[PDB]
């Protein structure tokens, strides 16, 4: 355990608000946002409206012309914009050499399931549409949005849209019901009832274990190949070994990594993480790699 997590974990335990408080949604939305990382000032923006939602171009330098990344931000499908998110994508765009196309897609509970994957699969429509080529695509995404590429992918799928070159989720929320071993197993270590409220929240009465919702129940035969990151030390272990062992049983090709003493969304602290970089990079080397094959 490097001491950059040792400490970034003291902070979020020094921070946190106490067990079984219940903040209100637009104190977690606000905060949220008052606490985003600024992306670094080499990437460039531009504002873009995509399937009747506010995105942004997200490009860092070095980027590769007729690339793309679908990027789905994570929030628990409650929470997070493109300014949450900015930051890491940018990262991730500098990492892979391909622009990033970050929506800011509808977040229940004004806009409930299946809103999100609606505007995901439309986001990537758009993109094929704009002519970039599947091949040339790639989706990617973080905790929930890591669940929803999944959803997305799927719902695409069932539609006739052919499949990107690769899928890239982080932490993947990709089981509504919350029912796995890690959720006490891992509690422990994870500094990171809250995540109930935002599965009733999202499903609005809907089954939990609808496909395109939970799509760790989902048929993912046909999907092009993953990478899974996932911490050992959250909450959502699970959710990713699960994910890899239905990819395999699909005949999906999943590569799962889970970087041992690593918190949920570990990639988001790279400004004070190594591990938070060096999985960024990971992630544009799978993205590249995947690319020219």
Request: proline share 7%; net charge negative.
């Amino acid at each position: 355990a490097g001491p950059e997590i040792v400490k970034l974990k003291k902070i979020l335990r020094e921070k946190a608000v106490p067990p079984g408080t219940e903040v209100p949604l637009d104190v977690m939305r606000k905060g949220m946002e008052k606490v985003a990382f600024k992306a670094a000032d080499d990437i460039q923006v531009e504002q873009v409206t995509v399937a009747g939602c506010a995105a942004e171009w997200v490009r860092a330098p070095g980027c590769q012309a007729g690339k793309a990344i679908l990027y789905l931000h994570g929030g628990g499908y409650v929470m997070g914009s493109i300014n949450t998110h900015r930051s890491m994508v940018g990262e991730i765009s500098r990492a892979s050499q391909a622009a990033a196309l970050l929506l800011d897609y509808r977040l229940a509970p004004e806009h409930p399931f299946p809103a999100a994957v609606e505007d995901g699969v439309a986001a990537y429509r758009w993109l094929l549409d704009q002519g970039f080529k599947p091949q040339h695509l790639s989706i990617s995404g973080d905790s929930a949005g890591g669940g929803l590429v999944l959803a997305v992918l799927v719902s695409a799928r069932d539609q006739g849209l052919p499949m990107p070159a690769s899928a890239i989720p982080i932490s993947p929320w990709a089981d509504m019901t919350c029912t796995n071993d890690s959720f006490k197993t891992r509690a422990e270590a994870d500094p990171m009832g809250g995540i109930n409220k935002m599965a009733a929240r999202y499903l609005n009465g809907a089954d939990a274990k609808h496909p395109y919702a939970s799509p760790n129940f989902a048929n993912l035969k046909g999907l092009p190949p993953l990478l899974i990151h996932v911490g050992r030390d959250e909450v959502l272990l699970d959710d990713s070994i699960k994910l890899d062992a239905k990819a395999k049983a699909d005949g999906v090709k999943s590569t799962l990594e889970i970087w041992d003493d690593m918190i949920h969304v570990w990639h988001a602290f790279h400004p004070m993480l190594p591990e938070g970089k060096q999985a960024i990079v990971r992630v544009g080397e799978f993205m590249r790699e995947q690319w020219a094959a």
